[PDB]
Design a protein around this ligand. Structure first.
Ligand SMILES: [Cl-]
Ligand SMILES: [Cl-]
Length: 162
């Protein structure tokens, strides 16, 4: 298991524009297009992202290419983030993937907002961090995915994904 297989399980793969759990236009493996209500604004973001006129449909290769960019960008955003970096540096390989997953889902700003949980993770207080992480909109809105990520932080294993 690795970050790509983990996120592929969590996000799925869709080759036609769709709406995410929040009602936003998305495509591929969790690639957010726009938060705007307009489908045309989404087709336009999509063509710009891909470099061709797509008419709302992409190929497997194109989805995977966006996926590779998004993972790379999540990692880079964590390392540039003054709040996230020290947490990331402190974690083992498995838990680092858990943190990348949360950033990929909610953005670096959102994750950097879980102040108390981050402090707990850095301190290696696994059980306490798991309890604090669950007291969130994130956990309440997407409980199955949240539980998998939370179990990954708690155990430092890929058990929840196998
Ligand atoms: Cl893009
Ligand atoms: Cl879920």
């Amino acid at each position: 298991m690795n970050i790509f297989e983990m996120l592929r399980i969590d996000e799925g793969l869709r080759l036609k524009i769709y709406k995410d759990t929040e009602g936003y236009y998305t495509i591929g493996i969790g690639h957010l297009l726009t938060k705007s209500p307009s489908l045309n604004a989404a087709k336009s973001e999509l063509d710009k992202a891909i470099g061709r006129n797509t008419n709302g449909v992409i190929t497997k290769d194109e989805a995977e290419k966006l996926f590779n960019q998004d993972v790379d960008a999540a990692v880079r955003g964590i390392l540039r983030n003054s709040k996230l970096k020290p947490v990331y540096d402190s974690l083992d390989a498995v838990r680092r993937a858990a943190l990348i997953n949360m950033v990929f889902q909610m953005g670096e700003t959102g994750v950097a907002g879980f102040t108390n949980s981050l402090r707990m993770l850095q301190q290696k207080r696994w059980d306490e961090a798991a309890v604090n992480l669950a007291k969130s909109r994130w956990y309440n809105q997407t409980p199955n995915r949240a539980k998998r990520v939370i179990t990954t932080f708690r155990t430092g294993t890929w058990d929840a994904y196998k």
